[PDB]
Design a protein around this ligand. Structure first.
Ligand SMILES: *[C@@H]1O[C@H](CO)[C@@H](O[C@@H]2O[C@H](CO)[C@@H](O)[C@H](O)[C@H]2NC(C)=O)[C@H](O)[C@H]1NC(C)=O
Ligand SMILES: *[C@@H]1O[C@H](CO)[C@@H](O[C@@H]2O[C@H](CO)[C@@H](O)[C@H](O)[C@H]2NC(C)=O)[C@H](O)[C@H]1NC(C)=O
Ligand SMILES: *[C@@H]1O[C@H](CO)[C@@H](O[C@@H]2O[C@H](CO)[C@@H](O)[C@H](O)[C@H]2NC(C)=O)[C@H](O)[C@H]1NC(C)=O
Ligand SMILES: *[C@@H]1O[C@H](CO)[C@@H](O[C@@H]2O[C@H](CO)[C@@H](O)[C@H](O)[C@H]2NC(C)=O)[C@H](O)[C@H]1NC(C)=O
Ligand SMILES: *[C@@H]1O[C@H](CO)[C@@H](O[C@@H]2O[C@H](CO)[C@@H](O)[C@H](O)[C@H]2NC(C)=O)[C@H](O)[C@H]1NC(C)=O
Ligand SMILES: *[C@@H]1O[C@H](CO)[C@@H](O[C@@H]2O[C@H](CO)[C@@H](O)[C@H](O)[C@H]2NC(C)=O)[C@H](O)[C@H]1NC(C)=O
Ligand SMILES: *[C@@H]1O[C@H](CO)[C@@H](O[C@H]2O[C@H](CO)[C@@H](O)[C@H](O)[C@H]2NC(C)=O)[C@H](O)[C@H]1NC(C)=O
Ligand SMILES: *[C@@H]1O[C@H](CO)[C@@H](O[C@H]2O[C@H](CO)[C@@H](O)[C@H](O)[C@H]2NC(C)=O)[C@H](O)[C@H]1NC(C)=O
Ligand SMILES: *[C@H]1O[C@H](CO)[C@@H](O[C@@H]2O[C@H](CO)[C@@H](O)[C@H](O)[C@H]2NC(C)=O)[C@H](O)[C@H]1NC(C)=O
Ligand SMILES: NC(=O)c1cccc(-c2ccc([C@H](N)Cc3cc(F)ccc3F)cc2)c1
Ligand SMILES: NC(=O)c1cccc(-c2ccc([C@H](N)Cc3cc(F)ccc3F)cc2)c1
Ligand SMILES: *[C@@H]1O[C@H](CO)[C@@H](O)[C@H](O)[C@H]1NC(C)=O
Ligand SMILES: *[C@@H]1O[C@H](CO)[C@@H](O)[C@H](O)[C@H]1NC(C)=O
Ligand SMILES: *[C@@H]1O[C@H](CO)[C@@H](O)[C@H](O)[C@H]1NC(C)=O
Ligand SMILES: *[C@@H]1O[C@H](CO)[C@@H](O)[C@H](O)[C@H]1NC(C)=O
Ligand SMILES: *[C@@H]1O[C@H](CO)[C@@H](O)[C@H](O)[C@H]1NC(C)=O
Ligand SMILES: *[C@@H]1O[C@H](CO)[C@@H](O)[C@H](O)[C@H]1NC(C)=O
Ligand code: NA
Lengths: 728, 728
């Protein structure tokens, strides 16, 4: 009898998924790390050479965390002393290595504790942020030119985002953008002077006698938000003037009338930049297209080139207005926007004309635009077989929109239905990355004739190992409710028998625009639960979920904690009505937004669930950040949506928890969903006399991802689920 | 056939013990509150009169927390708007009511948020502290005189103690001392300027959007301590035109050479005050006796009147040097000190003579001196039947120390073995309070011939109720370890059958000078565990425990976390050998110092215990406060005792928790044993991969005493223990 996929296998990663992470350095070459050596591959023929011997930095004296080669291939940036901060931010030390001279540069080194660094897109200029100010080095070994003098810890951020912009707007720490050929450096400046601070203790190593109080400018719903300004500086003038001028580009009048955000920055040409602004009430955004005026050294944004994007049913964009993809001459661009039917498709815009033309349409959506050439636009969508949880690469002829070719749909339909892509510099080649439903498969292709060049990694090694394991199977299907299809997936135990009644665990996230039902292959906790514990693990995408049109996504507008919660309960009812589920053993669990939904469900009094686990749950919307919360909930004031804010808390459902078994878990150093959120849930449960299980994780953040805490939490949850389901 | 004592009985106080709290107002009468009415009783005859109508304040508007009648009976201080701070501190509002004119005083009233207030010992002067400064009122309706002007929140404390002095030295918030007739007012001033602050979050009500950060000057072991100064002001010469002059009394030179503390202030006569000072290395103390000089208006403390108290085996006193009891003329005093055998007895001192004479002796100890007349000294001791856990009242003839008479031993030996007492103003009468082993008994006596006047409260009502309940019994006995006896007690289930095997729960505290084996009657969690769950609850007093001499108490000097932990394991090992104990079901639990011992025991690898519960445990001595910790551990420096500070942590024993079930509990707003202590334990366990159970209590402090949290924690621990013992 073959072994099963156990908890230890998951926690120790015995069955390793292989991937193929390459870095395009040109239009026909990429870098790949093999046996700690950096190799350079020729896409066309597959042959290669050693770009940088693994013994190059054996006496560097430091473990190198990452590297970055300059665009011209002349230097390599070495990152070490990596210190993580939030989801994307971190600080580190950097050294620059001269490839040609094969020497490390020791003069005018990048400062320690540097917050962000980036090469110019062409050549080898560098821009970095240190102590919240921007610096530019024209040459690696020469002195830096300071660009800003206003930087101030926790107050003024130049070229880097503050906490909320990093997490909710840019999903990046950097807030600087080099123009295409490197002449200009654009950047944002955030001012958090009046933004309130979240404070929590950090205990650190046992040797620290007094706990440290961490303080972070973080605007909770309805609080004072950071303000923002945008500037552009000409780096080519740096060595000619003592102090180069940063030219400010002001937001439009329609934005200046109230609170607003800078939400996108995209260069069009060497002398034209586009910026998108979003009002604090996130259903109105404006894009300005600004040109450099060589006679005045200023940037002007013609109103005739301004584009408005608004929404009558919800917020704008999936999580923010989408980015534009400009044609080479910068006179037109393509952008994903929702059409009249509520589905996101690609629209073609002339920069000085307000009405655009949709080039794709249908009851499916475009996920992203991947590359644009003079003759073709490449994009990823879920059109294939009408499966919203699938992803394929398509090519559309710019001179004839009726000519659309799916480049990945039929490569291996049974094994591959979820693709992402990586194009070379001028799109001459592309790497396809299949991530499911079968084992991930990485392949290389030539754009000139769309022919497959070779398989890069097929995971045959893993497939061989899994042959001797009783793996679970995955079912992806839908149920019809109110004439609408809603998709779900089920991880089913080996030798599934529909004549038996299996316990069921509902794995939930369900946040706005989320998707938990897809064709991706995963080896995770659910794999062990189904394989070893014979538990069915299901997920359902109901109202509020994404990639299926606005009608579904905007159903929860201004009403978080309602339909998305109700639909998970209904999904459980539908699953029990399938005949192979033990109604007496239905559990539910979720992390983050999933923890909020899990808690709301356990406190609904539905009687459908026996037990549930919430990890780092949101508990009341006024405790979460402004940008994310307000996008879906508006403002917490009597004149706007305060009543629903107060009506959608977990605490108000405390009494109903007497009907279930609950495990509440939270990391004490969670900078995202503050420990405070679970602290209030527990106090409300204690106040009504409800017993429950709890676990805090000292110094862990929203990811509870340290190696030991990760193993500890899944082990703890495994015992809780096995006990609730009466499993040996 | 009858009911047992249930968890609900304990949590809802179904069976209440009646008390008889009286307040002596002279040598012949006392005040007693009955039906909200304050009555005055004549001690000789037992007749009473109404002193103050319960309705007198029907329209007061505020809920009165407590009351305090001036010594001359002319006024009554009304306390309301009570707001608790630490163990003893709190702030409140006050109003003074004139009893003669039956009117509430409205002129010059005591401010709101007053930190401390007290009537002078004679008459009706008042002294109060507000905003950290001292004020004095000669008449209730007249304006107050500002005595100090340096008061500053969290920095300068005049007349009130800072956190550490409140908890560890004076066991009180008050740092004011009126002279016998009220002429002088002595006070201490604490300076916490350089004391580090402990910081932690307070979540408050759900409505608070951002958690609050509490900051408290708290010196952990080895950190900078507050400094202290002492002053005396003459309240009979106060002027409303000039600021009051406070005369400072400086500490002796042997104290000023290094860090030190003020540990006792006791007035001897109208013009003589004694003060005891203690070195930061708590084995050297000095008492100064100071006399007022009418000519200079200064206070002089003659070196010839200095008395040194030191210890070569440990620290000085049980928790601090004991208080002196001066004779009427103030020329001599009686004080409890450790004799040459290491047993605490009463020594008689001449104020200007170095050698004192012990007036009691034996292998037992005097607990406290209770009253002194020219012919007799009254004291409580555990001499009777050689039981260190028993307490009786004795009197010794000052003219012949061989004449010692026990006054409570034979009153009712079967019901009463643990007494405390309350003497009238001139020791003419005394109230005896028996607290066990039977139900509490309160009686009144006359000193002239020790007549038993009457029974004040015999709890016959409770006795009648308990007759219908299957109550547990208590066994007090000893085991011998190395020729030394150590006492233990066992709460035994109803109908205890020595032929059956019972699970056993070891209830531990075990801090230095602690005593957990005694003759006190208690209705608590253990009562329920024994009565309803048939669990034997045991407690043992090992090395380090009190009231049995320094040989036992000082055994753990400079060595916390060693002998006291080992002795609990040895006791359990012995109890497990007994025929009526199921060695497969032995558990252990403790709170505070008891949580530390429980944790050190569970991490010892002894294999004796199946499970255990630690509530608000200390985990590393460097995290606890200086005054208490250093008293037993010295300083955490390599030159002193750092190695043992580092070897006595719970964290270092994490690996050994793999074979036990552990439940760790802690209140997040614990200002005494910071949450930090449990946060480091959990992280250590996560780091070695040990699973355990946890529960935090939002906003609860060291007492986890709020009504809902109290019920919740005992409910949670009860489930944990029953589950560990496989009990229905
Ligand atoms: C891959 O193999 C090709 C063919 O051998 C290499 O082609 C070289 O191309 C350069 C142009 O830059 C010509 O001057 C040479 O004739 C070719 N090399 C030699 C040694 O003759 C190519 O360099 C190889 N690429 C890698 C990364 O190894
Ligand atoms: C960041 O924003 C703050 C306001 O929140 C600005 O501070 C004000 O600056 C003006 C101009 O000197 C002063 O008169 C005010 O007293 C300041 N107000 C506050 C609340 O500090 C600040 O100038 C901005 N900083 C930058 C670099 O833009
Ligand atoms: C470079 O130019 C900037 C912009 O003029 C200077 O920044 C100003 O500095 C003055 C005085 O130090 C302040 O009053 C202004 O508020 C600053 N403006 C900004 C936008 O920061 C900067 O000091 C100059 N650096 C040097 C070396 O001259
Ligand atoms: C990058 O683009 C910039 C902007 O077009 C170029 O700078 C201009 O160069 C022209 C010469 O062709 C000059 O007449 C202008 O004065 C320059 N404008 C500015 C703002 O500098 C720049 O030459 C390009 N860089 C490279 C390497 O091609
Ligand atoms: C309380 O005791 C003080 C000190 O002995 C008394 O004050 C003294 O009173 C006499 C009058 O007989 C004066 O000669 C002294 O100068 C006073 N000394 C001081 C320091 O004031 C006071 O009278 C006593 N109070 C009561 C009510 O007996
Ligand atoms: C009070 O206790 C301290 C510490 O135990 C004693 O001081 C010295 O402590 C060090 C270790 O920290 C020893 O090496 C010394 O032998 C101790 N004695 C001296 C004089 O340094 C101190 O002796 C104790 N005081 C009394 C009166 O016993
Ligand atoms: C208790 O009883 C005595 C009587 O024995 C009361 O009487 C004493 O005090 C009265 C005023 O308080 C006087 O009117 C009596 O003359 C006096 N008698 C004696 C013998 O002392 C006494 O007041 C009563 N005390 C209380 C508190 O009610
Ligand atoms: C309380 O203690 C502080 C610190 O010991 C006293 O201030 C002293 O220390 C300062 C630095 O912290 C020095 O700059 C000063 O010279 C010294 N004195 C003063 C007045 O600052 C402080 O005075 C003390 N306060 C009181 C009322 O005693
Ligand atoms: C302390 O607070 C109390 C209650 O607020 C004060 O009492 C009065 O409160 C009323 C409202 O209830 C106010 O309008 C008055 O101003 C307060 N004072 C008086 C005299 O009525 C009280 O005054 C405060 N303590 C002090 C010393 O002012
Ligand atoms: N920047 C983008 O365009 C973009 C593109 C894809 C996804 C996202 C994205 C989506 C969700 C977030 C939320 N902070 C996730 C989240 C939700 C919550 F309730 C509690 C905690 C939490 F962490 C943050 C960023 C952003
Ligand atoms: N002031 C006195 O003379 C006196 C008399 C009797 C008892 C005490 C006394 C005894 C112990 C304390 C300790 N802070 C108790 C304690 C110990 C610990 F590890 C963790 C927390 C904690 F809370 C505080 C005061 C003091
Ligand atoms: C490069 O370094 C690695 C260390 O991880 C070593 O194992 C490998 O053999 C080296 N490369 C070659 C070609 O030997
Ligand atoms: C970075 O800091 C380290 C540690 O102090 C120091 O040794 C090194 O010289 C610094 N490097 C630079 C470039 O400043
Ligand atoms: C944007 O949202 C606000 C709040 O619901 C609403 O009042 C306003 O009309 C909306 N604007 C549009 C164009 O829908
Ligand atoms: C005073 O009020 C209490 C209310 O708790 C009442 O029981 C008592 O009878 C009242 N006093 C008198 C003398 O009636
Ligand atoms: C009393 O002392 C304080 C503080 O030094 C001062 O402000 C006040 O004016 C003084 N009052 C008199 C009457 O001297
Ligand atoms: C005596 O007994 C104690 C415990 O009571 C033990 O620690 C010690 O080693 C024994 N021997 C001596 C000489 O103290
Ligand atoms: Na009697």
């Amino acid at each position: 009898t073959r072994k099963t996929y156990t908890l230890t296998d998951y926690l120790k990663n015995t069955y390793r998924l292989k991937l193929y992470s390459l870095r395009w350095i040109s239009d026909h070459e990429y870098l790949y790390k093999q046996e700690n050596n950096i190799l350079v591959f020729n896409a066309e023929y597959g042959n290669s050479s050693v770009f940088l011997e693994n013994s190059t930095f054996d006496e560097f004296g430091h473990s190198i965390n990452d590297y970055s080669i300059s665009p011209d291939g002349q230097f390599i940036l070495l990152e070490y002393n990596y210190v993580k901060q939030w989801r994307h931010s971190y600080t580190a030390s950097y050294d620059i290595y001269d490839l040609n001279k094969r020497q490390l540069i020791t003069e005018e080194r990048i400062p320690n504790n540097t917050q962000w660094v980036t090469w110019s897109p062409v050549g080898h200029k560098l821009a970095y942020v240190w102590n919240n100010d921007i610096y530019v080095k024209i040459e690696p070994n020469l002195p830096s030119y300071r660009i800003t003098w206003t930087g101030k810890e926790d107050i003024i951020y130049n070229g880097i985002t503050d906490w909320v912009y990093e997490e909710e707007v840019f999903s990046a720490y950097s807030a600087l953008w080099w123009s295409p050929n490197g002449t200009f450096l654009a950047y944002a400046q955030f001012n958090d002077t009046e933004v309130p601070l979240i404070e929590y203790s950090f205990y650190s190593d046992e040797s620290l006698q007094y706990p440290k109080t961490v303080r972070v400018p973080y605007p909770k719903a309805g609080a004072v938000n950071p303000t923002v300004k945008f500037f552009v500086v000409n780096t080519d003038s740096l060595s000619s003037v003592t102090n180069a001028t940063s030219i400010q580009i002001t937001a439009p009048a329609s934005m200046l009338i109230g609170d607003h955000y800078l939400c996108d920055v995209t260069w069009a040409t060497q002398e034209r930049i586009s910026l998108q602004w979003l009002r604090r009430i996130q259903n109105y955004s404006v894009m300005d297209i600004c040109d450099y005026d060589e006679s005045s050294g200023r940037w002007n944004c013609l109103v005739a080139r301004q584009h408005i994007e608004m929404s009558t049913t919800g917020w704008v964009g999936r999580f923010r207005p989408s980015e534009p993809h400009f044609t080479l001459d910068g006179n037109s661009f393509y952008k994903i926007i929702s059409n009249e039917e509520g589905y996101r498709h690609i629209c073609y815009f002339q920069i000085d004309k307000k009405d655009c033309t949709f080039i794709t349409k249908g009851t499916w959506e475009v996920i992203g635009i991947e590359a644009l050439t003079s003759d073709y636009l490449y994009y990823i969508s879920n059109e294939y077989k009408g499966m919203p949880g699938g992803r394929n690469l398509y090519k559309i002829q710019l001179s004839d929109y009726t000519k659309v070719t799916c480049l990945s749909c039929e490569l291996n339909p049974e094994r591959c239905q979820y693709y992402s892509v990586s194009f070379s510099k001028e799109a001459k080649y592309y790497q396809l990355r299949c991530s499911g439903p079968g084992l991930p498969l990485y392949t290389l292709h030539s754009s000139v004739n769309d022919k497959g060049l070779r398989v890069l990694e097929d995971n045959s090694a893993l497939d061989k190992m899994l042959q001797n394991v009783q793996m679970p199977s995955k079912k992806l299907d839908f149920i019809i409710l109110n004439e609408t299809k809603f998709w779900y997936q089920m991880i089913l135990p080996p030798h599934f028998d529909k004549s038996k009644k299996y316990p069921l665990l509902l794995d939930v996230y369900a946040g706005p625009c989320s998707q938990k039902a897809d064709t991706v292959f995963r080896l995770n906790w659910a794999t062990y639960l189904a394989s070893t514990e014979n538990i069915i693990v299901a997920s359902f995408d109901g109202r509020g979920s994404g990639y299926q049109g606005d009608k579904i996504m905007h159903a929860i507008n201004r009403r978080l904690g309602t339909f998305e919660v109700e639909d998970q309960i209904e999904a459980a009812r539908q699953f029990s009505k399938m005949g192979f589920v033990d109604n007496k053993r239905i559990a539910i669990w979720g992390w983050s937004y999933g923890g909020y939904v899990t808690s709301m469900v356990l406190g609904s009094g539905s009687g459908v669930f026996k037990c549930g686990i919430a990890v780092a749950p949101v508990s009341r919307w006024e405790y979460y950040d402004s940008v994310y919360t307000e996008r879906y909930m508006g403002l917490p004031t009597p004149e706007d949506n305060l009543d629903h804010y107060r009506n959608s808390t977990v605490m108000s459902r405390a009494e109903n928890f007497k009907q279930v078994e609950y495990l509440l878990i939270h990391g004490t150093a969670d900078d995202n969903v503050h420990f405070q959120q679970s602290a209030q849930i527990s106090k409300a449960l204690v106040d009504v006399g409800v017993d429950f299980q709890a676990m805090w994780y000292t110094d862990e953040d929203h990811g509870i991802a340290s190696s030991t805490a990760h193993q500890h939490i899944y082990t703890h949850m495994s015992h809780f689920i096995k006990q609730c389901f009466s499993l040996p």
